Amino acid sequence: SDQQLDCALDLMRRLPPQQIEKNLSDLIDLVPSLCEDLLSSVDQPLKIARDKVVGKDYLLCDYNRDGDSYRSPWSNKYDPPLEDGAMPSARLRKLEVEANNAFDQYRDLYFEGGVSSVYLWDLDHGFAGVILIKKAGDGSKKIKGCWDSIHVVEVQEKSSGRTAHYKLTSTVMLWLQTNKSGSGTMNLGGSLTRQMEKDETVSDCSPHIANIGRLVEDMENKIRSTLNEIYFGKTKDIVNGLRSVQTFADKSKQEALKNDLVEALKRKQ
Amino acid sequence: MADFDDRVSDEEKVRIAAKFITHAPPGEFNEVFNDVRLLLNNDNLLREGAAHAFAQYNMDQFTPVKIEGYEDQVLITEHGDLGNSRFLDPRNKISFKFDHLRKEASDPQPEEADGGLKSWRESCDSALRAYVKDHYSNGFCTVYAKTIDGQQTIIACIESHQFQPKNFWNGRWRSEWKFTITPPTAQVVGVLKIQVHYYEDGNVQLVSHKDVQDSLTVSNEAQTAKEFIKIIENAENEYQTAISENYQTMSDTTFKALRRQLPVTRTKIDWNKILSYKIGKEMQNA
Amino acid sequence: DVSRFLRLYLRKEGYDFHSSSEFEIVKAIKERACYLSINPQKDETLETEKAQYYLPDGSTIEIGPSRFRAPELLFRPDLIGEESEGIHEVLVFAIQKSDMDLRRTLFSNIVLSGGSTLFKGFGDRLLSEVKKLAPKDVKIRISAPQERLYSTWIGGSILASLDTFKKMWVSKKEYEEDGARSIHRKTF
């Protein structure tokens, strides 16, 4: 049922972003034939798991999942345990753990806490992977929020010249609540998706992690600015459009003076 | 073989469909209904089973309806519900049937429910219309008179919306004010709610509300109606002002608190330095 | 802020201008010899020619790479350490916030003003950045009046000459009666 799949996805866009897990489950039970397409297509909140081997909290993706079991990036083990041995190389384990260390310092500086997990899988042309970042607001603090971001990267390594093609896709989902006595209980949700393509120089001085790292933070900065300025601005404009504090009668006085000016400007030509 | 023998029951389909329909965003109601219709694939079950979801949405939103032969519109609300899908128009002193799917009024009949509160309602309705015209560019209001547990109450509902699906946004304002007159005092209960959806190349949704509590000294009809409107004016002005303050506040506090624009050092991360520095700083800071 | 950033960079090069009077010379150096590079990382990496500047007393200082590295602050505010958008981001964002119908006309009609746009090759760098940030297949026409500095004043002279201006301003008597309200009511 292709028409039901379109209707299911179009509905989820309009439904509240906090009720996506419960609302998605209901649509899956109605049309269970398109369960795989709905789960894959629809953006879901990031689930967290505790690795008892290393003693570290890691974020769960679709890439690390081998059947039912999820691989922990710090331990490089599948929970529940498997004997499939799907690890593409030993060099990948060194690059993946080093990458996690790079973005572990990153999140501590920008976000200050939360969890970050980097999953790398090798490909014939060049390695790909996903970088999951999740930051939750303090429970005791009046301010409530939830940061979710998914950075999918595919690196196409060139034979000669050392100028790999970096393809980045970034999906951010933001929850906000302000419990100020003046306003009451304000809830402002949003979700944005963007893509970027560059051709950075790879070397010992300029490694893959350095080239990817700059592209990841650059996309987050553009999304942070655009959301706060463009989307949150437009939202404020509509609220002020609905009701006015100043009387229209007083506004029409200033409009009549402005209109008279415009006529006097077009007049004097 | 994916087990297709556990199909959702007709009662469960109605419960799910009714939830999706009743929570549809302002200006996207029909779009939600059409999607739900295809998902259930049972027109008889949805039409008969979700009838209360159409009534609930139209009343929750204060859906204004045009009555043939009258200049203004009347708001569809729970306070006007006379049964048999008919609502009271207290200004025009008639009842009418309302089609919740088509949003059409028909068969207007004389109906007078105000009783001894006619003078109280007329003073409040006139003062409110002047207020709505001054503060709402396309605002509508309906004022009902009720006796609640023996108490005299005037109920003022105000609705205003802006729907521009061609511009990828819809917004609705709602305000409900119940003024219960118990001489020498009156209880003021207000609920203000705003919802805005902007979905050009993304999805951002605002849902905000505030409960308002106040009290007044009861006088005559003319002075009591004027004081009620001024209480509404002050409370709605503070509410809109606080939302404007929250936009500036979120940028500086909550929004930056989740993700800083820069680290506490006010510098961009030097990825080449971090790879070598991480090892140096772990031993130098120990 | 660019003049302050240039002074900081010249001190690293080894030319001190501690006095407030000497800072005016740093501004004069910027105004006389300062160009905005079309590619910043190219000119940053490449070894720059030591371009000499003659100070009021007669002493010669080598300005060198500081010419093009100083003005970059307008497009990269992190250089000074300010959490703000670049000048090229401000222009595009301001247009994108406007309604869909006007966005194409606002991109078509872009007017440069202010003294800080007078940098050599400013228009070339800005026009490149606007096209990258702006949507695909949009016409970007940036017009610069020769008298950028005088644009604000000349407009004021035109408005003041109009008879409608007599109704627009607030008289002394009106101010005394209403107070601060009179300016807020009549100000646009």
CATH number at residue A170: 3.90.1150.210
Q: Which of B88, B113, B138 is the last residue of a domain?
A: B113
Does residue B273 fall inside a structural domain?
A: no
Same domain? A83 vs A100: no
DSSP code at position A80: S
A199: contact with C, CB 8 A cutoff: no
The tokens of B70 are what?
A: 């009258």
Separation of alpha carbons B195 and B25, rounded Å: 8
The SS3 assignment for A117 reads strand
Same domain? A52 vs A94: no
Same domain? B120 vs B242: yes
Residue in chain C nearest A255 by alpha carbon: C188
Q: Pick A264's closest partner by Cβ from C85, C93, C162.
A: C162
**How many Cα atoms are found within 13 Å in the side-chain-facing hemisphere of B211?**
3
Separation of alpha carbons B51 and A84, rounded Å: 54
Contacts of B85 (CB under 8 A, 6+ apart): B55, B97, B98, B99, B100
Q: Which of A52, A70, A88 is the last residue of a domain?
A: A88
Query: What letters, b where the CB count within 10 A reaches 16 and e where it falls short, cover A228-253?
Result: bbbbbebbbebbebbbbeeeeeeeee
Residues of C in contact with A225 (CB under 8 A): 85, 89, 93
Same domain? B66 vs B131: no
Separation of alpha carbons B92 and B71, rounded Å: 10
Same domain? A93 vs A214: yes
Same domain? A79 vs A109: no
Q: Which of A37, A69, A88 is the last residue of a domain?
A: A88
CA distance, residue B154 to nearest chain A CA (Å)? 23
Q: Look at the alpha carbons of A90, A93, A99, A102 in this order and tell me if their dihedral is positive or negative.
A: negative
Domain count, chain B: 2
The tokens of A162 are what?
A: 């050392």
Cβ <8 Å between B240 and A239: yes
Is residue B115 within 8 Å of B130, Cβ to Cβ?
Answer: no
Separation of alpha carbons B257 and B259, rounded Å: 6
Tell me the residue range of the domain where A11 lies: 1-88
Is residue C112 within 8 Å of C87, Cβ to Cβ?
Answer: no
- Cβ under 8 Å to A: C residues 158-177: 162-164, 167-168
Separation of alpha carbons A201 and A187, rounded Å: 44
Which amino acid would we find at residue C100?
M
In Å, how far from its chain's centre is CA A28? 24
**Tokens 């989820």, located at residue:** A12
Is residue A231 within 8 Å of A190, Cβ to Cβ?
Answer: yes
Inter-chain CB pairs, B–C, below 8 Å: 12
Strands (E), C29-89: 52-54, 60-62
CA distance, residue C97 to nearest chain A CA (Å)? 6
- Residue closest to B123 by CA, chosen among B73, B181, B207: B181
Separation of alpha carbons B197 and B204, rounded Å: 6
Same domain? A244 vs A148: yes
The SS3 assignment for A108 reads helix
C188: contact with A, CB 8 A cutoff: yes
DSSP code at position C98: S
Is residue C122 within 8 Å of C34, Cβ to Cβ?
Answer: no
Q: Look at the alpha carbons of A106, A110, A116, A119 in this order and tell me if their dihedral is positive or negative.
A: negative
Contacts of C167 (CB under 8 A, 6+ apart): A257, A260
Same domain? B34 vs B75: yes
Residue C94 CB neighbours (<10 A): 11
CA distance, residue A14 to nearest chain B CA (Å)? 7
Mutate which of B268, B269, B270 to test chain C, going by most C C-beta atoms within 10 A?
Answer: B268
Does residue B282 fall inside a structural domain?
A: no
Give the pairing type, strands A115-121 and A77-79.
unpaired
Tell me the CATH number at A14.
1.20.58.570
Resolution in Å equals 3.5
Same domain? B80 vs B129: no
Same domain? A80 vs A95: no
DSSP code at position C49: P
The tokens of A246 are what?
A: 């100043």
Same domain? B105 vs B145: no
Is residue B103 within 8 Å of B63, Cβ to Cβ?
Answer: yes
CA distance, residue A79 to nearest chain B CA (Å)? 26
Same domain? A159 vs A43: no
- Residue closest to B89 by CA, chosen among B145, B165, B18, B27: B145
Residue A21 CB neighbours (<10 A): 10
CA distance, residue A230 to nearest chain C CA (Å)? 6
Residue B191 CB neighbours (<10 A): 14
Is residue A135 within 8 Å of A114, Cβ to Cβ?
Answer: yes
Separation of alpha carbons A261 and A267, rounded Å: 9
Is residue C76 within 8 Å of C160, Cβ to Cβ?
Answer: no
Contacts of C171 (CB under 8 A, 6+ apart): none
Cβ <8 Å between A257 and C164: yes
Longest alpha-carbon distance in chain A: 86
CA distance, residue A80 to nearest chain C CA (Å)? 45
Cβ <8 Å between A229 and C93: yes
Does residue B12 fall inside a structural domain?
A: yes
Beta-bridge partners for B207 = A187, B195
Separation of alpha carbons B286 and A4, rounded Å: 59
Is residue B67 within 8 Å of B105, Cβ to Cβ?
Answer: yes
Phi, psi of B45 (to 5 degrees): -65, -45
Tell me the residue range of the domain where B170 lies: 114-258
Separation of alpha carbons A133 and C146, rounded Å: 50
Q: Pick A105's closest partner by Cβ from B194, B199, B278.
A: B278
**CA distances for C188 relative to A258, B175, B241, angstroms:** 8, 31, 21
Which amino acid would we find at residue B190?
G
- Residue closest to B39 by CA, chosen among B53, B19, B58: B19
Is residue A74 within 8 Å of A64, Cβ to Cβ?
Answer: no
Residue B190 CB neighbours (<10 A): 20
Residue A36 CB neighbours (<10 A): 11
Contacts of B234 (CB under 8 A, 6+ apart): none
Percent of chain A as helix, strand, coil, to the nearest 5: 40, 30, 30
Residue in chain C nearest B265 by alpha carbon: C81
The tokens of C50 are what?
A: 């030591």
Q: Pick C188's closest partner by Cβ from A234, A258, A264.
A: A258
A255: contact with C, CB 8 A cutoff: no
Helix (H) or strand (E) holding A110: helix A90-110
Q: Which residues of C touch B (CB under 8 A)?
A: 78, 81, 83, 99-100
Is residue B277 within 8 Å of C98, Cβ to Cβ?
Answer: no
Q: Look at the alpha carbons of B39, B42, B44, B49 in this order and tell me if their dihedral is positive or negative.
A: negative
Cβ <8 Å between C83 and B267: no
Residue in chain C nearest B169 by alpha carbon: C99
Residues of C in contact with B167 (CB under 8 A): 99-100
Phi, psi of A134 (to 5 degrees): -135, 125
Is residue A178 within 8 Å of B246, Cβ to Cβ?
Answer: yes
Separation of alpha carbons C143 and B193, rounded Å: 46
Domain count, chain A: 2
Q: Which chains touch A (3 or more CB pairs under 8 A)?
A: B, C
Cβ <8 Å between C99 and B266: no
Contacts of B286 (CB under 8 A, 6+ apart): none
Beta-bridge partners for A175 = A146
**CA distances for A150 relative to A21, A103, C144, angstroms:** 17, 13, 42
Which amino acid would we find at residue A213?
G
Does residue B189 fall inside a structural domain?
A: yes
Residue C14 CB neighbours (<10 A): 8
CA distance, residue A209 to nearest chain B CA (Å)? 8
Cβ <8 Å between A230 and C164: no
Same domain? A190 vs A62: no
Distance spanning both ends of chain C, measured CA to CA: 30
Tell me whether residue C142 is exposed, middle or buried, using C-beta atoms within 10 angstroms of its C-beta: 0 to 12, 13 to 18, 19 or more: middle
The tokens of A86 are what?
A: 């799907």
Q: Pick B167's closest partner by Cβ from C78, C83, C100.
A: C100
Is residue B97 within 8 Å of B103, Cβ to Cβ?
Answer: no
C157: contact with A, CB 8 A cutoff: no
Cβ <8 Å between B262 and C100: no
Residue in chain B nearest C98 by alpha carbon: B167
Is residue C20 within 8 Å of C7, Cβ to Cβ?
Answer: no
**CA distances for C138 relative to B104, C75, C108, C131, angstroms:** 45, 21, 8, 8
Separation of alpha carbons A10 and A17, rounded Å: 13
- Residue closest to A56 by CA, chosen among A69, A74, A76: A74
The tokens of C44 are what?
A: 């940053």
Same domain? A68 vs A94: no
Separation of alpha carbons A180 and A4, rounded Å: 41
Q: Which of A33, A63, A88 is the last residue of a domain?
A: A88
- Cβ under 8 Å to B: A residues 147-166: 147
Same domain? B122 vs B182: yes
A254: contact with C, CB 8 A cutoff: yes
Is residue C53 within 8 Å of C32, Cβ to Cβ?
Answer: yes
Separation of alpha carbons B62 and A162, rounded Å: 64
Give the pairing type, strands A144-156 and A128-136.
antiparallel
CA distance, residue B164 to nearest chain C CA (Å)? 12
Same domain? A15 vs A117: no
Same domain? B35 vs B14: yes
Q: How would you write chain B as a 3-class SS string?
A: CCCCCCCCCHHHHHHHHHHHHHCCCCCCHHHHHHHHHHHHCCHHHHHHHCHHHHHHHHHHCCCEEECCCCCCEEECCHHHEEECCEEEECCCCEEEEEECCCCEEEEEEECCCCHHHHHHHHHHHHHHHHHHHHHCCCCEEEEEEEEECCEEEEEEEEEEEEEEHHHCEEEEEEEEEEEEEECCEEEEEEEEEEEEEECCCCEEEEEEEEEEEEEEECCCHHHHHHHHHHHHHHHHHHHHHHHHHHHHHHHHCHHHHHCCCCCCCCCCCCHHHHHHHHHHHHHHCC
DSSP code at position A47: P
The SS3 assignment for A150 reads strand
Same domain? B124 vs B65: no
Same domain? B122 vs B209: yes
CA distance, residue B67 to nearest chain C CA (Å)? 34
Inter-chain CB pairs, A–B, below 8 Å: 230
B275: contact with A, CB 8 A cutoff: yes
Same domain? B11 vs B104: yes
Tell me whether residue B252 is exposed, middle or buried, using C-beta atoms within 10 angstroms of its C-beta: 0 to 12, 13 to 18, 19 or more: exposed
**How many Cα atoms are found within 13 Å in the side-chain-facing hemisphere of B194?**
27
Peptide bond into B90 cis (omega under 30): no
Separation of alpha carbons A151 and A194, rounded Å: 10
The tokens of A256 are what?
A: 């009549």
Category of C38 on φ-ψ map: left (φ > 0), alpha (ψ -120 to 50) or beta? alpha
